[PDB]
């Protein structure tokens, strides 16, 4: 649908700005996710399983 009349977009918007702005946004945003999520209950690193190989092996 959108694509046909959306090529004209790059006719006012520089390819570099979109290429540069998007990378910056996708990554910082990507980071602010696992990040804001990691600190959230569904944490995965030290939250639950697999079997406490640390608690078992350590002591």
């Amino acid at each position: 649908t959108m694509n046909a009349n959306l090529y004209k977009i790059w006719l006012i918007l520089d390819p570099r700005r979109v290429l540069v702005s998007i990378v910056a946004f996708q990554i910082v945003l990507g980071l602010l996710i696992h990040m804001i999520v990691l600190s959230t209950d569904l944490n995965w690193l030290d939250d639950n399983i697999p079997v406490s190989y640390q608690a078992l092996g350590k002591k």
Binding site: V28, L31, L32, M35, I36, L38, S39, N43, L45, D46
Partner: protein, 319 residues
């Protein structure tokens, strides 16, 4: 009633000068330099462009990370409710690890993000000193910034790697927030005697003063004789003139002795460096060395002695 070089009255402009080109290795400069009449009503109205090498990016990256931590964890605090984040801003922050994990990697929670974020404001900061010496001499320029930067970067480490980690305490290392950080200095003064008694601070002060003094004089002086190209020091350094003539003379018939359009700039770079130098000094002694500088002082015959219109009692003794 003479135009006292305050704000460049009438300005003028010419194309974007992307500086002197660089050798084989210095990647392309970047940016489409801009102009701001306002900013320019004080200094070089042109804006940019700026360089960006490896450490350039590498450092900047290691930069907006700690920020994205010390920034995040902070917002989290006021339970992701910005409104208050905005309110309790100057109060918020991110504290270090609890006295337990003295040096051990703190858990993902208890002071963890701070050690994480910290190290990333440990490298990027140290990496940016590289983004100097590098872009510095690759200009055919000697190194005096790079130098000082260290002196300063020294003190920063005297507030971390070198001392906090030197006393086994992921606590003895400053917090991470305006107020709280504003508190650390407060807390410190106490925990150990009272800094006003650790010479290397009462010292590092006189400097933070001198700079607050000199670069404050020579800033004027230059101006005073800025008509006579004083501002052009560059050449005045080489081919003198009436500038350095009228100037130094002033101080000659004032405080007596005086110096040169060169020399001054020396003491400048010095007092400055000789500041953070003395800073990290005391801060390094204070901790693993003397524990109470007030006691130190008097014990050396330093600390004064006044009469006594008030005194108290001591429970631990009578009781």
């Amino acid at each position: 009633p003479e135009y006292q070089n305050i704000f460049t009255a009438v300005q003028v402009r010419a194309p974007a000068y992307p500086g002197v080109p660089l050798p084989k290795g210095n990647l392309p400069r970047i940016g489409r330099p801009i102009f701001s009449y306002w900013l320019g009503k004080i200094g070089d109205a042109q804006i940019g462009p700026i360089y960006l090498g490896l450490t350039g990016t590498l450092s900047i990256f290691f930069g907006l990370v700690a920020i994205s931590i010390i920034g995040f964890n902070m917002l989290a605090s006021v339970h992701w409710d910005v409104f208050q984040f905005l309110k309790h801003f100057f109060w918020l922050g991110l504290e270090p690890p609890p006295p337990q994990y003295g040096l051990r990697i703190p858990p993902l929670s208890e002071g963890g993000w701070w050690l994480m974020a910290g190290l990333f404001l440990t490298l990027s900061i140290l990496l940016w000193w590289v983004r100097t010496y590098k872009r510095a001499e690759a200009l055919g320029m000697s190194q005096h910034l790079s130098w000082a930067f260290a002196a300063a970067i020294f003190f920063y480490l005297v507030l971390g790697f070198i001392r906090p980690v030197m006393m086994g305490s992921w606590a003895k290392a400053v917090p991470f927030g305006i107020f709280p950080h504003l508190d650390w200095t407060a807390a410190f003064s106490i925990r150990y005697g009272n800094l006003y008694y650790n010479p290397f601070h009462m010292l590092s002060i006189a400097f933070l003063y001198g700079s607050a003094l000199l670069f404050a004089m020579h800033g004027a002086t230059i101006l005073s004789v800025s008509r006579f190209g004083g501002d052009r020091e560059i050449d005045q350094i080489t081919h003198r003139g009436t500038a350095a003539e009228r100037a130094a003379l002033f101080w000659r018939w004032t405080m007596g002795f005086n110096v040169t359009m060169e020399s001054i700039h020396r003491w400048a770079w010095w007092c400055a460096v000789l500041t953070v130098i003395t800073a990290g000094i005391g801060i390094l002694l204070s901790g693993t060395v003397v524990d109470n500088w007030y006691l130190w002082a008097v014990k050396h015959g330093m600390a004064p002695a006044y009469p006594e219109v008030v005194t108290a009692v001591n429970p631990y003794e009578t009781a």
